[PDB]
Amino acid sequence: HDNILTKIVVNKTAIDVMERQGYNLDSVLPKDEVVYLRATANLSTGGIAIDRTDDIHPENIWLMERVAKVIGLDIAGIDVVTSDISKPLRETNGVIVEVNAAPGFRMHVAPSQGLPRNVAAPVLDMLFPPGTPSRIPILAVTGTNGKTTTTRLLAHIYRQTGKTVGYTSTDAIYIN
Amino acid sequence: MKILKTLTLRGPNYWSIRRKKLIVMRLDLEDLAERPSNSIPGFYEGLIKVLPSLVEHFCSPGYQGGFLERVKEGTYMGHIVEHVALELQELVGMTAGFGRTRETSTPGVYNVVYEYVDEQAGRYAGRAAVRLCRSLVDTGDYPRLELEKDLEDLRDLGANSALGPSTETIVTEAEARKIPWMLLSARAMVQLGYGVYQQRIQATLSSHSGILGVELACDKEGTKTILQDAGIPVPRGTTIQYFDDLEEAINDVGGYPVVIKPLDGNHGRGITINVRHWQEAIAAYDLAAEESIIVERYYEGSDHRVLVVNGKLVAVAERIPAHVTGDGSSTISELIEKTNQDPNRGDGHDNILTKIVVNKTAIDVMERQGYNLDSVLPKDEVVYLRATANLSTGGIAIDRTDDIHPENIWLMERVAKVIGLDIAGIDVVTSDISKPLRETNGVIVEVNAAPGFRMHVAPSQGLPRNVAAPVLDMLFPPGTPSRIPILAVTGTNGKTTTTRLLAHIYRQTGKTVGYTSTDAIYINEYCVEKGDNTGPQSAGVILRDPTVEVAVLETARGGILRAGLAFDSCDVGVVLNVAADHLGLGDIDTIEQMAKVKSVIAEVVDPSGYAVLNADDPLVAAMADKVKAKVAYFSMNPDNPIIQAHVRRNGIAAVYESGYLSILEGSWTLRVEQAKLIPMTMGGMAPFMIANALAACLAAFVNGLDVEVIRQGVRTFTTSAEQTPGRMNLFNLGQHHALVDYAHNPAGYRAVGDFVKNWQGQRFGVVGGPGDRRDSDLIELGQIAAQVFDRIIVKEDDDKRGRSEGETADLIVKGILQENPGASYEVILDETIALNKALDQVEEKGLVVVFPESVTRAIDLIKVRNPI
Amino acid sequence: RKIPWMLLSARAMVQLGYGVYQQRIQATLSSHSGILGVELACDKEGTKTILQDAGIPVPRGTTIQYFDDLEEAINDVGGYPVVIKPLDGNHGRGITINVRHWQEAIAAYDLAAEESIIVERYYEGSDHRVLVVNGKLVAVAERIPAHVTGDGSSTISELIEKTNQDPNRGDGHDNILTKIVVNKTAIDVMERQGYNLDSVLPKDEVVYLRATANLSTGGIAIDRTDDIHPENIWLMERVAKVIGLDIAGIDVVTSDISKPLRETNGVIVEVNAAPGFRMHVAPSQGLPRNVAAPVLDMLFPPGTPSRIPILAVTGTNGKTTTTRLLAHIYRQTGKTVGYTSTDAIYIN
Amino acid sequence: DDDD
Amino acid sequence: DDDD
Amino acid sequence: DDDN
Amino acid sequence: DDDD
Numbered sequence A: 001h002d003n004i005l006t007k008i009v010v011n012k013t014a015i016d017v018m019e020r021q022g023y024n025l026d027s028v029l030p031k032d033e034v035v036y037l038r039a040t041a042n043l044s045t046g047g048i049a050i051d052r053t054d055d056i057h058p059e060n061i062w063l064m065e066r067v068a069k070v071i072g073l074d075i076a077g078i079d080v081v082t083s084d085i086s087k088p089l090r091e092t093n094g095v096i097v098e099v100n101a102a103p104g105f106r107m108h109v110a111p112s113q114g115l116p117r118n119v120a121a122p123v124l125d126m127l128f129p130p131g132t133p134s135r136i137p138i139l140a141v142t143g144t145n146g147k148t149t150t151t152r153l154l155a156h157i158y159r160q161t162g163k164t165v166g167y168t169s170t171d172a173i174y175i176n
Numbered sequence B: 001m002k003i004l005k006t007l008t009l010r011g012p013n014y015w016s017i018r019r020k021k022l023i024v025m026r027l028d029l030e031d032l033a034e035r036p037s038n039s040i041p042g043f044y045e046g047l048i049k050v051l052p053s054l055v056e057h058f059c060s061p062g063y064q065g066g067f068l069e070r071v072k073e074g075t076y077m078g079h080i081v082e083h084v085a086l087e088l089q090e091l092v093g094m095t096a097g098f099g100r101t102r103e104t105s106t107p108g109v110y111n112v113v114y115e116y117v118d119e120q121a122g123r124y125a126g127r128a129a130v131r132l133c134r135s136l137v138d139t140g141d142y143p144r145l146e147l148e149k150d151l152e153d154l155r156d157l158g159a160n161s162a163l164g165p166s167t168e169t170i171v172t173e174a175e176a177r178k179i180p181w182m183l184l185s186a187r188a189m190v191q192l193g194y195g196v197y198q199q200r201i202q203a204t205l206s207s208h209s210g211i212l213g214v215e216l217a218c219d220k221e222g223t224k225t226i227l228q229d230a231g232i233p234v235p236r237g238t239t240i241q242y243f244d245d246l247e248e249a250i251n252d253v254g255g256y257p258v259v260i261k262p263l264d265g266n267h268g269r270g271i272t273i274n275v276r277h278w279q280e281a282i283a284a285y286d287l288a289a290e291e292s293i294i295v296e297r298y299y300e301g302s303d304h305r306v307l308v309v310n311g312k313l314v315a316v317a318e319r320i321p322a323h324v325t326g327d328g329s330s331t332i333s334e335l336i337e338k339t340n341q342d343p344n345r346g347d348g349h350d351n352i353l354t355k356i357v358v359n360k361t362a363i364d365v366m367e368r369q370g371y372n373l374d375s376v377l378p379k380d381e382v383v384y385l386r387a388t389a390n391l392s393t394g395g396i397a398i399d400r401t402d403d404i405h406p407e408n409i410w411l412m413e414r415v416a417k418v419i420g421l422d423i424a425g426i427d428v429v430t431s432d433i434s435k436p437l438r439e440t441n442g443v444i445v446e447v448n449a450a451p452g453f454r455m456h457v458a459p460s461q462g463l464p465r466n467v468a469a470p471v472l473d474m475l476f477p478p479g480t481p482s483r484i485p486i487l488a489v490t491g492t493n494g495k496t497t498t499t500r501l502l503a504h505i506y507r508q509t510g511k512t513v514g515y516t517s518t519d520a521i522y523i524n525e526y527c528v529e530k531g532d533n534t535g536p537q538s539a540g541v542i543l544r545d546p547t548v549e550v551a552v553l554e555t556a557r558g559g560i561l562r563a564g565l566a567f568d569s570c571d572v573g574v575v576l577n578v579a580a581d582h583l584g585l586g587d588i589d590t591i592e593q594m595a596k597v598k599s600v601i602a603e604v605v606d607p608s609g610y611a612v613l614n615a616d617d618p619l620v621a622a623m624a625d626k627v628k629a630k631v632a633y634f635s636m637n638p639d640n641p642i643i644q645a646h647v648r649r650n651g652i653a654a655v656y657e658s659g660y661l662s663i664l665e666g667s668w669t670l671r672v673e674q675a676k677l678i679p680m681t682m683g684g685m686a687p688f689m690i691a692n693a694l695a696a697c698l699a700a701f702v703n704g705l706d707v708e709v710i711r712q713g714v715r716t717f718t719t720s721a722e723q724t725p726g727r728m729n730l731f732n733l734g735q736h737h738a739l740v741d742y743a744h745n746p747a748g749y750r751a752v753g754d755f756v757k758n759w760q761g762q763r764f765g766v767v768g769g770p771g772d773r774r775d776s777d778l779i780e781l782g783q784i785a786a787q788v789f790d791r792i793i794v795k796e797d798d799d800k801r802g803r804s805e806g807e808t809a810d811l812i813v814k815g816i817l818q819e820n821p822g823a824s825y826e827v828i829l830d831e832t833i834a835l836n837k838a839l840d841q842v843e844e845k846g847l848v849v850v851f852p853e854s855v856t857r858a859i860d861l862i863k864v865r866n867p868i
Numbered sequence C: 001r002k003i004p005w006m007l008l009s010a011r012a013m014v015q016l017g018y019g020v021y022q023q024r025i026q027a028t029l030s031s032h033s034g035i036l037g038v039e040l041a042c043d044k045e046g047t048k049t050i051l052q053d054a055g056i057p058v059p060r061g062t063t064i065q066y067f068d069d070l071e072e073a074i075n076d077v078g079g080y081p082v083v084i085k086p087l088d089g090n091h092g093r094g095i096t097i098n099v100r101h102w103q104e105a106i107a108a109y110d111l112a113a114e115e116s117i118i119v120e121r122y123y124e125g126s127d128h129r130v131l132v133v134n135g136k137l138v139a140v141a142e143r144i145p146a147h148v149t150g151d152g153s154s155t156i157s158e159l160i161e162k163t164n165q166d167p168n169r170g171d172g173h174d175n176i177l178t179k180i181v182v183n184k185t186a187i188d189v190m191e192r193q194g195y196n197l198d199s200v201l202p203k204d205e206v207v208y209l210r211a212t213a214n215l216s217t218g219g220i221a222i223d224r225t226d227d228i229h230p231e232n233i234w235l236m237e238r239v240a241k242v243i244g245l246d247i248a249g250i251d252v253v254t255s256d257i258s259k260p261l262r263e264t265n266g267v268i269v270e271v272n273a274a275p276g277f278r279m280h281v282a283p284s285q286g287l288p289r290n291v292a293a294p295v296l297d298m299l300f301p302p303g304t305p306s307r308i309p310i311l312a313v314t315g316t317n318g319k320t321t322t323t324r325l326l327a328h329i330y331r332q333t334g335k336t337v338g339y340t341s342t343d344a345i346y347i348n
Numbered sequence D, E, G: 001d002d003d004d
Numbered sequence F: 001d002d003d004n
């Protein structure tokens, strides 16, 4: 993870993928011909990832959100096969291949082309919705003499409001 | 010494942000400007004997007498007129000590600035200081009679404008809580809060006090009926319609110990509280008979006042009438003189208690007790000098708030709810407030809507209570706002355009948005008023409006210099640019001074809010060191070192990059839209429109709007003809275009010139220049046109003809031929249908740029050609 | 709507709902009507000042404290086509609506002088009443004074008898319209128009028998609720909010309610707290409106109760014991519980 | 006064 | 009337 | 008034 | 399994 992309490695699996395409290592390619060295995409194997977030059609947005809700997952990765993400899937004859619970983020926060996205911000916004606290009040008491007495009285006063009050002292740890 | 001009400032201003209340006087020292005191014999001794208190004045020397260390070494009447006006106000009890003097204009004209408390008293003191100071430089003294009458006028001016004590009490607490307040133009009402959160008060009545409740409380028979039907203890009594039936009424009531009142309510008049005999009933009757509740059983006990605010008890006080006691074997007239010397007794509200006055009514009250003025009282005997309690007549009030029994608390709260009043005073007669009323045989005598507070906030015994705090808590409940968001936009150029766009973006959230501009005042696209509506008087229309949720205000230097800002503080302060426009006006001659006026907006932004600064402008970026608020920046160059240093510390900035308008938030980039796809920007060819769009987007973002809302707002915003006439109106006439605009200062000529440079069409023609009211900047305009246009024709002989005839055109011709004398430099002078009609001299896809004196005509004539 | 109601023992008030959900009304005033708002609405100078400081169109006019300054006042107002009113408010008395001459101003003045807003510019148009209930428009009706028209070449006294026989006209509230009465005031109104009882009218000429509109004096009311322009709706709602009144009647003078007031040069003449309803629930032309429904919806908002739970206990033996126990159980929930027994009435 |  |  |  |  010290880079965006990684190295291309020639192995027996690269050879097998090239043979199916009619090519090998000493073959010369025609101008702009593309040869794949792997069967599937993955940044960790030397592939690429292009941000297309702003090119997705409104109907496709609606469908993707409906898929996550039908399968009941909050954070989800949906794998879609299509020739054109800017057109409705029904017109391009595209399909939804897989729904993945708990997906990774490298491809969205460190793409090789396009702009990086702040993926975490939408996660923290569901866990800690706007306007709500993430902390409880803390009252810390110190000094050479009188701490335990002051601590028990202060906890007693808050307790009269009906809240759960926890406290620590030199005698014990208490809750209500 | 003559006074040429006077301004009254009310709000943050040029001279001070905190000293909101100032008077600025433009003083013409026709004499004395040439005579620095040493040249005015006697003008040291006369001044100190007339106003001996002027030792408490400090100047540059940080000393008592620092003022008087000078004077003999004159200040050319600066300082002296200033210090005298301040002292004349102090001598009558108004405290104000800020002041400054600065020379302006030609020699001898000064701006004298001093603090005021009351607006009319302040202006009066200024004029009086000038008369006093001018007499002492003529003669060596000032007659005492002409000093005392002026002090008397200041005392009256400051009395007439005073708020009563119940309103002072609420207002003082409102300020402590940061709730803004205003006086209204009718019925002595005060407004608290802005827009949709506003409340109104009047004395002890508020926006929460219902009419049915208040009217019932004023109806004594009605009140009694409603309370006894609720199981609440009230006095037993009846009705006699001025027939001599007094002797019959006592049969139902309970015998002779009765109370006889005027049947109607006309102050405390014609009332006998403890009738003991038949003939007394008749005398009481004869007085009762004067007016339009006449025999009530008399109950024994003290008179207690209970204050309830929101169906909840606030304070209790016991009231006792003026009296003297047997403090040794002294007479009553001696006892009155002995206690009427108490230091806590005096007139008005300058004391806790007031003076005891012997009058025929004191004599009548004492006769019923068997005493008169020369009588000697037995030790500890008490004699009352009044029938009823009242602090204003010399009685006392004792706080008993913590001694009231829980059952009595419950009953008092129930009474206020039954009669339907929020703030209520309940009059209770009981021998012991610490025991239940049913056990002490006490009664509830009266329920008073809208009670006063002196007895609870300034008791003679016991501790004072903060009565206002429970009132403000019902009007503005904990956790709720008292203000609406304020977005203030200033700068030399671009304010109106930025203001309309920003209001448009907020409007996409469905809120009511009000705004002011130089064209009109609008609320949600309806026009409220037309004309130049910038300045504090217009800002007030929006802030007082009960429907407004968001306020967007363009702010001009005319309003700031003439009367201060209308709002005190705001959430977003946007400063777009500082440029050399309006110099020489309002005593501002330099650009460094103009920047101090514009910085007023940045310096009033609340610490929790933001200032939005232009990082490409060296005077504006520098304001960042005065701002107490957070700072956000915008620029047209992503590599501006300011922006880079700022985002590296996780600040926020808006930049134009790669064809996009984007927001830099720490390390992340948020793209909003492409410049070419935002209609206000002419295809991305007008850099000044892009900069105005960046400022609007950034202000919306830092104040919490989502990016999608911002995108929707920029895409649908338009600046077409007749919405924004005279501001980039581009007309399509077959294979030909014409542009109508209305520049003023040079920056607007350069901004338009850049649009023209990007016009990849044919010829660039211009048909004009400046009017006759500009300073010597005609050459600068000519220099700008010379490098932007290849067809330059001069029409500077307008109809107004502020100066002579065609000289303006002659200066423009001199300027344009100075830089590039190869653009068919015709001067035609006429600009009605002569030069602005000659568009057929330009080939296909060329552009004609029009700078008319009157936009209305330019956009009328262009329509005669049938544009698309 | 199943909301229980009771009459109260004082000031003709009516209670709606039980316990903590109760509301009170009196005629057209309610528990939601504030005192500051109602008093401001009764102060004509105060009302005008507050509205013009809000950018709302009102009549142009001045003050004369019974000095013969009528001739000076017209210089600020706009000449002779003016309105002269008693300075104080004591019913519709001593008022001349369209003064055309100096001597008329004096006669108007002499009547105005009877009481304790004296020269206003006169505006042309019809008298429209707008009803606003909770910062929201409910109904609009156009009011026209009693009149007769040139329905053939007949005289005015004949025309009055012809139309005063209409079956929809009668006394009180037993009809929609009422009878036209000829009196000295009808004669005075007709004289100013150049007509009297034996005059024959030109075809379709209209003669007014009264200075102002009122259904109780024989005029008419036309429902125009669906013809009001969206901008005018916005302005009327803003007026009620500025003066602080929930239920309000706004008097508007305009030639066309379907166009913006700024284009027709119309004005807002008066804001009335606690208006009546006959003209909106029983109009002479147009469809009747259910005015009460918007009032009950503010007092008892949708989804809220108007009643508190009632538990009634009876039987020959055991009632008091059962009653005290049941009240004790409810009390453990922290609510205020009231109950009655043969020993006493208790609350908590 | 009522019904204004 | 005020301050009752 | 004029504010500019 | 993580990062699917």
Ligand SMILES: Nc1ncnc2c1ncn2[C@@H]1O[C@H](COP(=O)(O)OP(=O)(O)OP(=O)(O)O)[C@@H](O)[C@H]1O
Pocket: A143, A144, A145, A146, A147, A148, A149, A150, A170
């Ligand atoms: N404010 C005080 N100043 C001086 N002595 C105090 C004060 N309060 C209590 N003491 C004395 O010191 C003793 C310390 O008791 P306490 O348990 O409150 O002390 P502590 O500081 O909380 O505890 P510790 O020393 O165990 O951390 C008390 O019993 C009393 O004798």
Ligand SMILES: Nc1ncnc2c1ncn2[C@@H]1O[C@H](COP(=O)(O)OP(=O)(O)OP(=O)(O)O)[C@@H](O)[C@H]1O
Pocket: B235, B259, B261, B265, B267, B268, B271, B273, B296, B297, B298, B299, B300, B303, B388, B389, B427, B429, B445, B446
């Ligand atoms: N029945 C009564 N028994 C004893 N004291 C009474 C009785 N009725 C009234 N008082 C007292 O006598 C005084 C008469 O005031 P009253 O209740 O008539 O109100 P008011 O008309 O507003 O006059 P004021 O302004 O003097 O209070 C009050 O101090 C009240 O406490």
Ligand SMILES: Nc1ncnc2c1ncn2[C@@H]1O[C@H](COP(=O)(O)OP(=O)(O)OP(=O)(O)O)[C@@H](O)[C@H]1O
Pocket: B491, B492, B493, B494, B495, B496, B497, B498, B518, B556, B576, B577, B688, B689, B691, B692, B726, B727, B728, B741, B742, B743, B744, B747, B748, B749, B751, B752, F004
């Ligand atoms: N950011 C800018 N920098 C320089 N010139 C600008 C800028 N924005 C607009 N202009 C030019 O200045 C003109 C002033 O138009 P605008 O109404 O926006 O100015 P203003 O400063 O708001 O108003 P005013 O001078 O009337 O108070 C524009 O039509 C344009 O030619």
Ligand SMILES: Nc1ncnc2c1ncn2[C@@H]1O[C@H](COP(=O)(O)OP(=O)(O)OP(=O)(O)O)[C@@H](O)[C@H]1O
Pocket: C059, C083, C085, C089, C091, C092, C095, C097, C120, C121, C122, C123, C124, C127, C212, C213, C251, C253, C269, C270
């Ligand atoms: N300036 C004016 N121009 C035109 N008509 C006006 C003007 N002022 C008032 N009117 C109309 O004349 C009548 C006078 O009523 P006014 O506004 O004086 O109220 P009022 O004192 O309550 O009397 P009333 O009970 O008759 O309405 C109303 O019909 C009103 O519409």
Ligand SMILES: Nc1ncnc2c1ncn2[C@@H]1O[C@H](COP(=O)(O)OP(=O)(O)OP(=O)(O)O)[C@@H](O)[C@H]1O
Pocket: C315, C316, C317, C318, C319, C320, C321, C322, C342
């Ligand atoms: N369920 C019962 N059946 C028969 N007798 C009962 C019952 N409950 C109580 N009693 C008897 O009858 C008496 C009536 O007491 P209680 O005050 O409860 O009666 P009540 O019917 O409520 O009152 P009342 O007759 O005064 O209207 C009790 O003291 C007891 O002796």
Ligand SMILES: [Mg+2]
Pocket: A147, A148, A169, A170
């Ligand atoms: Mg301890």
Ligand SMILES: [Mg+2]
Pocket: B495, B496, B517, B518, B554
């Ligand atoms: Mg402007």
Ligand SMILES: [Mg+2]
Pocket: C319, C320, C341, C342
């Ligand atoms: Mg029983």
Ligand SMILES: [Mg+2]
Pocket: B492, B556, B581, F004
């Ligand atoms: Mg300007």
